[PDB]
Design a protein around this ligand. Structure first.
Ligand SMILES: C[S@@+](CC[C@H](N)C(=O)[O-])C[C@H]1O[C@@H](n2cnc3c(N)ncnc32)[C@H](O)[C@@H]1O
Ligand SMILES: [Zn+2]
Length: 418
């Protein structure tokens, strides 16, 4: 069902270093209705390779995008963390590049349309592109125009014809989800005018390696990206990386701005600073990735033993959150419903379902509060600050959290952190 990678998406070479292999794993966003057996549950090979030319890190395989995205889970809410970051994206894009009010912003992977809504509140014209039909119907209903398609060279031409030249094209946590990134670059090139920008937000490979964030490896995530590999791609499509901002969101990310090579946007010094930093931290050396793989085996082992040791002492453990990355973590660690009795999640879509592979039940936060849990394994650790800030009562009662990265730890710690 899932097609194997041959050549590299970004630079086109074929010199792959193997880094880690988790074997066959079910899809992280395929939540299941509870049942007696789960024998026909699909699994796909989940393994990562590193390109020695440009140092894109890629999965060995590409699960069909039609299967992944045509019906996708979503929330109707949005946390305060998410809202604030979306406001920040607007501020950066508009203030750093002087985008006037009334300008046109096109967003790829626009989802329910809240990021575009933010742009509209700042006086912009918008349009979204997202293949999730269920989610696009919601955006459209709310008043956020969204084409229910994948982004392509042809869709790009349709947009230009009917909607004109965008001053900004935005893709947040979608660029790493697309196999044919050459085609994205080409459709972008055709959309961009002389001063237009293409901006993408993706998890940063430097942070992913240094903080041992192996749970962000899942089938939707085809690519794990540094600035180097983006320059290698965009070189070959008349595009130039002109600016980068590092961000704490999603365990360390980069928001990368790209313009036409012959356009009016000058390259800022930070671009080369980050490429020099990637060298200096060893992204172009085989040892670094063997070290990453070493860390993964070590963290995986001590996380399971910590959990099983506390259960042997008669402590009750649950998962806090049921995000996609939590399902990589739990499957790789081999944890079952005997290890975690449930995972609480605020998404109603997920409540009453069961997780892929491990089949742990997903329950509401209001059920979770009735139960005497001793430890929550914090699966949604990227929202650690927002979560801990509202869990005073649990913490005051002696409840604890287990954080999986950079190394497994226990919150609260034994002394004031300073
Ligand atoms: C993880 S989400 C990101 C949602 C939102 N941008 C955010 O940052 O929260 C991935 C989204 O991109 C959409 N998507 C996946 N492949 C796409 C493609 N080739 N073109 C446009 N959208 C795509 C999915 O339907 C999904 O809504
Ligand atoms: Zn490459």
């Amino acid at each position: 069902t899932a097609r194997a990678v041959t050549t590299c998406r970004m630079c086109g070479a074929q010199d792959w270093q193997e880094v880690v292999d988790f074997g066959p794993v079910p899809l992280a966003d395929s939540f299941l209705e509870p049942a007696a057996s789960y024998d026909d549950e699909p699994r796909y090979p989940l393994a990562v390779v590193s390109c020695r030319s440009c140092r894109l890190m890629s999965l060995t395989h590409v699960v069909d995008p039609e299967v992944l995205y045509r019906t996708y889970p979503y929330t109707t809410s949005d946390s305060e963390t998410i809202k604030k970051h979306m406001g920040h994206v607007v501020a950066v894009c508009v203030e750093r590049f002087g985008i006037p009010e009334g300008s046109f912003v096109l967003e790829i992977g626009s989802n329910t349309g809240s990021q575009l809504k933010a742009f509209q509140n700042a006086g912009m014209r918008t349009l979204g592109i997202d293949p999730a039909r269920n989610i696009a119907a919601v955006a459209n209903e709310r008043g956020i125009e969204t084409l229910p398609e994948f982004f392509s060279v042809d869709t790009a031409a349709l947009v230009k014809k009917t909607h004109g030249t965008p001053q900004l094209v935005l893709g947040r946590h979608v660029f790493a989800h697309i196999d044919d990134v050459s085609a994205v670059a080409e459709g972008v090139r055709d959309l961009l005018g002389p001063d237009s920008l293409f901006a993408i937000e993706v998890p940063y490979l430097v942070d992913m390696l240094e903080r041992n964030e192996f749970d962000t490896i899942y089938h939707e995530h085809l690519s794990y990206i540094g600035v180097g590999s983006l320059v290698a791609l965009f070189r070959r499509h008349g595009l130039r990386v002109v600016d980068v901002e590092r961000l704490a969101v999603h365990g360390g990310s980069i928001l990368v701005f790209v313009g036409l090579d012959e356009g009016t946007r000058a390259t800022a010094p930070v671009v080369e600073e980050l490429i020099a930093l990637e060298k200096e931290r060893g992204l172009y050396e085989d040892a670094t990735y063997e070290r990453f793989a070493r860390h993964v085996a070590e963290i995986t082992a001590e996380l399971t033993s910590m959990v099983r040791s506390l259960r042997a002492e008669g402590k009750r453990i649950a998962g806090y959150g049921a995000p996609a990355k939590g399902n990589t973590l739990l499957n790789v660690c081999g944890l079952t419903a005997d290890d975690l009795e449930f995972c609480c999640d605020t998404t109603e879509f997920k409540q009453g379902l069961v997780l892929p592979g491990t089949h742990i039940p997903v329950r509401s936060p209001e059920y979770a509060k009735t139960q005497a849990i001793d430890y929550y394994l914090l699966l949604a650790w990227n929202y650690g600050e927002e979560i801990l800030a509202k869990e005073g009562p649990f913490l005051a009662d002696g409840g604890r959290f287990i954080l999986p990265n950079p190394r497994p730890s226990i919150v609260p710690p034994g002394e004031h952190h300073h």
